[PDB]
Amino acid sequence: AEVYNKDGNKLDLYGKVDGLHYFSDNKDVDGDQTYMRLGFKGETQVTDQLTGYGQWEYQIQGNSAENENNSWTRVAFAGLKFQDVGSFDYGRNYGVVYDVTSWTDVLPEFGGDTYGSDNFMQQRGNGFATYRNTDFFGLVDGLNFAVQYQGKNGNPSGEGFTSGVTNNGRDALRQNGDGVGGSITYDYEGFGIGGAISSSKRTDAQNTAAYIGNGDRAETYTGGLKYDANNIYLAAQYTQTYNATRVGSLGWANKAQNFEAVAQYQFDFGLRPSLAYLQSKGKNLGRGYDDEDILKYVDVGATYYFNKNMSTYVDYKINLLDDNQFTRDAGINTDNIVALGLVYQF
């Protein structure tokens, strides 16, 4: 909702409450999953060509008792945009690989989980410096590219570490050395085609015997396709990764091949059914694991839109992973899940 628009400054205050419940034989995901998100997007006109902006988004879980608080910052960044040249922003933001993979992250509840948060340059993460050029100086409609740098996020401070520390340090599964990446997308009418590449130094804390997938750098290569017209949405992405994909709590995959596909239709009366397939196939994993499925599921669901502010959905994760030693060791969910959600948003 735009709550302020005066003398060239605009402020949009937005959010949602998702009354949400999971049904699953897996009791670690089963039960109340209610949550809310809040955010703001602000923009200020500096000149006719130059605009400054900032965005912040926060998630607060609504499913805990009052003696605890489970909340986090999704994004927080400030930036400058110049008409027909580009933009730059810095902060917690999305990695440029997400420019392509976001195209299949459109499912009612699940999806978008061949990668995670704080996972090199694949999704949300800290310390992104992002440069973007839209429409190639305004001379090629629909063509966009981006180049991104990520600074090191290392070991926690004040915990007796003698190397690799940063002020905002964290556990090794969520660390990263310096990284660089890029994306190109082209959209003509309904069609879209895109590609992205990322390369991040891996830290010493990540390259210990306690984690599978030791390596100097984490690399990702992504291609994507999209069709979005005539009430039909189709998209697919394929990603090859090296020492970049987490294998639950075990560490990372030496190599992984990720694939996601989605098909959706929008009825006039407000119903939007969705069908999707995701898989992540790991190779040469180490410790005798050899080749294993990290993720494999079919997602069938539907959303009903009452209007732009109220909707309800059901999403059914038909989980094709089988319960074995590998998935047990990594703590990967192999059970089906049904989600039922009712969402108010502004």
């Binding site: 306690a210 709590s249 990594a330």
Partner: peptide, 23 residues
Amino acid sequence: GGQQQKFMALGSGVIIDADKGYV
């Protein structure tokens, strides 16, 4: 989901033989 590491432990005990100093 090798190096020696020092650790410290502490507990109680009961003297059970005063002559032999058995605890």
